[PDB]
Amino acid sequence: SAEHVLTMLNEHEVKFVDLRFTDTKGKEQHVTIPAHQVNAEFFEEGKMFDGSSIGGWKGINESDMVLMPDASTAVIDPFFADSTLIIRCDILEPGTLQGYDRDPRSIAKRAEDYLRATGIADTVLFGPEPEFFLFDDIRFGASISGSHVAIDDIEGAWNSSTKYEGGNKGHRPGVKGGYFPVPPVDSAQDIRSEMCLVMEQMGLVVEAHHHEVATAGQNEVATRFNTMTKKADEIQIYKYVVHNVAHRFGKTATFMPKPMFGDNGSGMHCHMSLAKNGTNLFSGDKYAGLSEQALYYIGGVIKHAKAINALANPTTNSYKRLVPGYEAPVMLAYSARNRSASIRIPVVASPKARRIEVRFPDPAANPYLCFAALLMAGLDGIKNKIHPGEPMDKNLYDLPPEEAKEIPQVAGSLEEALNALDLDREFLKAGGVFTDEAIDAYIALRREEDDRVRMTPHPVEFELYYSV
Amino acid sequence: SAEHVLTMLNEHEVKFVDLRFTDTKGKEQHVTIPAHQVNAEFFEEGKMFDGSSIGGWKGINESDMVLMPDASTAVIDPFFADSTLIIRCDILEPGTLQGYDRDPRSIAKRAEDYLRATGIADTVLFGPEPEFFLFDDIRFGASISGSHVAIDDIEGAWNSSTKYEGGNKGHRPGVKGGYFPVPPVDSAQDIRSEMCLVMEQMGLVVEAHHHEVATAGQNEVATRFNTMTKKADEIQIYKYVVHNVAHRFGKTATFMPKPMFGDNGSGMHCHMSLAKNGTNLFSGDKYAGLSEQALYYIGGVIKHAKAINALANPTTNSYKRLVPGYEAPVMLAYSARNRSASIRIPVVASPKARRIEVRFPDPAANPYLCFAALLMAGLDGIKNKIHPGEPMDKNLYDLPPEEAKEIPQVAGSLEEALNALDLDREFLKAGGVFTDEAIDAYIALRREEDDRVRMTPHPVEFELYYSV
Amino acid sequence: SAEHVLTMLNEHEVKFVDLRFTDTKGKEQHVTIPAHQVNAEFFEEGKMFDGSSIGGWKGINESDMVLMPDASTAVIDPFFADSTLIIRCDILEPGTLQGYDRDPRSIAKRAEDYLRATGIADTVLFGPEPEFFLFDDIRFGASISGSHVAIDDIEGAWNSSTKYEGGNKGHRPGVKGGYFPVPPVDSAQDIRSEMCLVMEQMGLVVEAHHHEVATAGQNEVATRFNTMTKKADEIQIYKYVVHNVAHRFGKTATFMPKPMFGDNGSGMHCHMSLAKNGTNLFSGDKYAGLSEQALYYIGGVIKHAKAINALANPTTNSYKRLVPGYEAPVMLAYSARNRSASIRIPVVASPKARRIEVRFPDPAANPYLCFAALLMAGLDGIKNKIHPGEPMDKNLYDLPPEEAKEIPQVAGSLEEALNALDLDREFLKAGGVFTDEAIDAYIALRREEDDRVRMTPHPVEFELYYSV
Numbered sequence A, B, C: 001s002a003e004h005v006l007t008m009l010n011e012h013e014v015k016f017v018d019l020r021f022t023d024t025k026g027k028e029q030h031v032t033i034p035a036h037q038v039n040a041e042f043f044e045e046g047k048m049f050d051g052s053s054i055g056g057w058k059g060i061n062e063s064d065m066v067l068m069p070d071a072s073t074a075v076i077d078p079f080f081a082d083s084t085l086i087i088r089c090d091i092l093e094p095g096t097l098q099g100y101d102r103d104p105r106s107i108a109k110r111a112e113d114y115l116r117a118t119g120i121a122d123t124v125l126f127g128p129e130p131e132f133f134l135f136d137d138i139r140f141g142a143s144i145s146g147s148h149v150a151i152d153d154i155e156g157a158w159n160s161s162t163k164y165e166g167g168n169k170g171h172r173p174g175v176k177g178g179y180f181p182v183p184p185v186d187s188a189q190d191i192r193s194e195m196c197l198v199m200e201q202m203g204l205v206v207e208a209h210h211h212e213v214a215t216a217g218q219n220e221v222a223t224r225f226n227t228m229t230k231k232a233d234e235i236q237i238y239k240y241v242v243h244n245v246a247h248r249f250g251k252t253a254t255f256m257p258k259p260m261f262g263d264n265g266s267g268m269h270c271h272m273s274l275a276k277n278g279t280n281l282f283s284g285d286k287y288a289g290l291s292e293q294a295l296y297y298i299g300g301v302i303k304h305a306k307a308i309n310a311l312a313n314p315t316t317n318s319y320k321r322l323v324p325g326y327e328a329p330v331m332l333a334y335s336a337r338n339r340s341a342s343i344r345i346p347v348v349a350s351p352k353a354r355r356i357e358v359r360f361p362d363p364a365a366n367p368y369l370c371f372a373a374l375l376m377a378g379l380d381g382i383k384n385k386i387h388p389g390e391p392m393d394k395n396l397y398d399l400p401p402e403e404a405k406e407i408p409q410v411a412g413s414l415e416e417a418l419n420a421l422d423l424d425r426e427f428l429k430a431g432g433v434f435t436d437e438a439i440d441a442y443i444a445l446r447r448e449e450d451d452r453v454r455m456t457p458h459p460v461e462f463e464l465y466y467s468v
């Protein structure tokens, strides 16, 4: 409670309260309040600001539900003490609820709590596995006359030839080969190790950290599962902390899905399962443990896969990863292997923890929308029948056409994905977790970027198309 | 009191007494006195210097009413201790009052206290919201042969492509998109956070701080309302502190209204309302809460809007912001939304705090003249009837002409504004708060600049006009 | 004739036909035709292209009246022979006349020939005196982050200190002091001398050339008077030739009115008078020779001075010259001296050549519109009475106000000028020489620039307004 927060305020001295607070149709935002100003009223009626990022015609002020005054903590990082204390959207206003043209954290719950009003179960766990890139210099720009971008970080093969002064020292990981190889070679740990400490400090639980697979600083930190609304918001920290230590160390950290080509572009796998009492109705018999229930879920996703990836796969870049691999998970099936397969029902053991890993989502989504939409579907499957059918176990590769061609795809390609969502509306819209707007506005946004991207001619195009 | 100041002097040791003291037809000034020299006499008869900035023919020495020996405090910043202790203009001389060709702080009060002698009420509150820019390097010059200016600060999009050495690190806010996004991206807080601490240290009350919306370091710090004379003079500190920490941090801070084009040029919104006993006669029923009274005010402004913006909208730059937007508040109406609308009657709640936000004024005015003139009018409306009519609620945009054309404008453009004031004299002149001179001198000044500006040919003109 | 042109074609071999042809609401344009393609049909039905520069909604092709197939000549400059052969606008189309949203050369004549249908006289002579600047390097640009421009040319004082290698050699003209001083000091002649040769080669008649008064390459070449339509179009060459030799020599030539500040920005004085048979009804008795007739003219201008300078004084820069001088001709009176006075009735001798010099117009106008509008007015004065009153002979300077203040001004300042024209319509509109459109479109254009100019903040503004 506040009574509490209240102490904490003195527990630590603190002044100011901020970093991470609102968070856009896109991601993260803050405002800073002098230490005083906090006080119940504050806790009970909020504070309010207005529009900007989704909003039309004048003055729609929005209450800032100083909230989840639980989701409150001392941010390491800022200078002088201060309780980073999220806010539950802007609630609305006098009605007091869905922030204008969103309230991502809201939608979260509508979803969440809505779930609860079905009975399909009682609690939904989400355990996302977001990877990120840690490089040294990131320069880029674009303009009438040209366009470009360059990435560098001691590591990333490329750099060997590179001259230094303390000079080369040459231990580094070559293209898809950043594979937990011990140090000299490992840009470093201390950055990860460190990120954990703070991650936990901030309040998440770390499960292991390590180097992913990419020539130039692909790093992954894992974090114990939660409840959509919580976990989603944990991603929000998970991120803030990375960005920051990373930067505090000397690097830039980036959750882009495909910074470079011919390497590995981080992706956010999401593991999930709902439970009733202390029973995860995702379990049972029938295929890899699991159960009827689950299957409708496996159903749900697969059904609106496209609309979802419009939600959990934005900015164009998203899809430069979601390029047909074999490695790359673009198939809409489930397996326990035979990847390529976008739904993995990991082995299990204790039914106690039987789940679903839908990997395709990329570190770029508001865990809020994404999770929501994941769930939202999952259960409309769980809901009206809907049935997986069989798992893959027969990797992609089949007389390419040979209906392997026929085979359902992960909606590779924004515009496309954007579309789906325009049509799928429904299963989202259901419960209230998702207004037409919300949906609209959302689309409407991603739309612009999609444009800026295609109107701007690409370096490669010259490569191939120039001298014609 | 002095008796007091007197202690404080020993309370702290201190030597010297200065920083911020007089303040021009334009803004801020000081002189330093060895610690001794202070002593009653001093408190009672002042100290005096002379002319320079407004003054004609020899020797008009002016008493320096060592005053508001309340408005006294230890300046952090200067080296060795010293009580920055304003001065109430130069009083005059033997008459002892309106400093030659001004006494901005005086005018303030004439106004203020004059207000009091009407009965329209007892106390006028002003709560300005001044925004400012925080950049790294500011180079410019002009001369027969050429002219120019360049601005830079890690942030401001432009800089991505830019090479560094610790190198890029690329998190920064792109054009109208400095929107409280959390750190990596936020040049930084510590500068704001910090500014608050000192702001309060200096004696103001902070209400929240944050990043405004502009590619390259638009920062805003908010401060609790006051009494014209006090608040006005608080702006005087609000400024000194910004300028200084900002500089002490490594940046230049600038209250110019439109440093760059296609971004956001800070503006000083001013919220106001007068009260009688502990009753703000600005309240009631009839439109958005409010009351008859208020309306005449809404009247007053609107009436002499032009003359006012001549006062609260100088240096040419002022108007490069006051360019017809839709966003930009150049309409002379009131709304509670439908911005574009230069008078916003914010929602309210407790009639306890019902007000008027007239946004158009820019961080560039002597809060003194500005506030004064704001008020001065406000009540001549409040005074002889004068009536708003209806609010907007129908944003600008109407068959441009379609009398939307007809519609009253915020006097966009200095010369113009200058003019108004030449004619409006009156409502200012009334009470004594404003001599012909004052007015004259004032005009007369802004005049020159306006000239230097138009005689000097502009980079763009070459753009477009050169090859003809 | 064509029959002719026809020879000329063989007289010289030539292939191609082009340089200078159409010419915008602004100034000059061409298209190149293979030598063949010319042939009567061509001469009789033209060639046609379409829109771009003034044009709305699709496809309005415009005939190109291969015309004034008189106004035809071998362009020195282009590579391979070619008959630069103007075109009489695009005529229209099937109607065949006023080019879409103009036909500047057309308007010219409507005017001209319209004149003829009044009887006020038979022929109007125009003898403009356009000055231009000849510099070495011209760099400038503007953009979110900054703006600027730099000018240089051995000459322009500034350069003395400048180091060279063949090194300094120091003879050059210091600020308002480029005054026919003999060579070492005179950037050079050969550029002028040369320009003459070609000017005549192109077909104009040179009367004398020399250095005007400005530190850095102000050059003037004079050319014998003509008929609006002819002379106007002569300016069109006068220009092309300058631009070109100038460039061919090693310099950039610029007809901007005020490239630099505190120097002299070229201006196009225009001398005029109409005649009946071989009698210039501008003569007589009554003031400085002259005659009733003239006076109504002197009237006409003075009457719509503002609207005219909107026509013969564009791009903003225009007015940085038309800044109140005493030297500077912004007064609306006539004198034979007492300059400051925008209308000079030069001494005379032979009534044979008695005229009117209205100096204010600047090298920047389509001689077409300008001349037209000059005339167009001139005679609406000549027309319905309208009367000068007395000449100045009492330079500006009179208790500034002392109604010297009262005194009619040269409409200094675009927006303003723009306006006038919006209202003055009439006297233009009269005859058909000027459609509402034409007028509209015109305005509408200058409008944009005027904007780009004021929205973009100015180097100086930082000078003065920054540290506030």
Ligand SMILES: [Mn+2]
Residues within 6 Å of the ligand: A129, A131, A212, A220
């Ligand atoms: Mn991984």
Ligand SMILES: [Mn+2]
Residues within 6 Å of the ligand: A129, A269, A357
């Ligand atoms: Mn995984």
Ligand SMILES: [Mn+2]
Residues within 6 Å of the ligand: B129, B131, B212, B220
């Ligand atoms: Mn603001």
Ligand SMILES: [Mn+2]
Residues within 6 Å of the ligand: B129, B269, B357
């Ligand atoms: Mn405001």
Ligand SMILES: [Mn+2]
Residues within 6 Å of the ligand: C129, C131, C212, C220
């Ligand atoms: Mn001359």
Ligand SMILES: [Mn+2]
Residues within 6 Å of the ligand: C129, C269, C357
């Ligand atoms: Mn002349």
